[PDB]
Structure formats: structure tokens, C-alpha cells
Amino acid sequence: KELVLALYDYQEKSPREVTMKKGDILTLLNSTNKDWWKVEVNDRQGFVPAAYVKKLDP
Amino acid sequence: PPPVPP
């Protein structure tokens, strides 16, 4: 599992988007789109803005 | 916060 940190709150604005709160840790599913990254939290899989998350690499 | 995308 690759992980991302929510840097800012994000409210879903379309059907395939996921809501997150600042500080949330999410599983990264796909980062090939420059603008939107696919993530996973709980039973949800969808997109958040790439600029709102940071990859958690040492 | 940053801008959303389009």
C-alpha cells in the first residue's frame, strides 16, 4: 500500500470524487493524471485533486 | 488551499 496525506479539506463536487478532511491518511490507487489522483478510504474509491495530497515517502 | 481542477 502506497499512502497519501490530505493537506487540505476537500468536499466532493462530482460523482467519482471522494471527500477528505485535512490530516486524513488515504491509500493511493493511481497518480497518472496530473490533476486528479485516485485514492481509497474505507469502502470508497475515487478521485481528489493531486494538489491536495502529498505522497508519504521518506 | 489550491484551486480545484476543471
Among A17, A22, A52, pick the best mutation site for testing chain B contact (most B Cβ within 10 A): A52
CA A23 to chain centre: 11
Query: Can you tell me the distance from the alpha carbon of B4 to that of A48, in angstroms, rounded to the nearest whole number?
Result: 9
Query: Can you tell me the distance from the alpha carbon of A25 to that of A7, in angstroms, rounded to the nearest whole number?
Result: 10
Helix H segments across chain A? Answer: none
Reply yes or no on domain A1-58 having CATH 2.30.30.40.
yes
Contact B5, A47 (CB under 8 A): no
Contact A10, A20 (CB under 8 A): yes
A41, A45, A47, A52 alpha-carbon torsion, rounded to 10°: 10
Query: Can you tell me the distance from the alpha carbon of B4 to that of A43, in angstroms, rounded to the nearest whole number?
Result: 24
Method: X-ray
CA distance B3 to chain A (A): 8
Kindly report the backbone phi and psi dihedral angles of residue A51, in degrees, each rounded to the nearest multiple of 5, phi listed first: -70, -15
Q: CA B5, A8, A33 angle in degrees (round to 5)?
A: 35
For B5, which residue in chain A has the nearest alpha carbon? A35
CA A35 to chain centre: 11
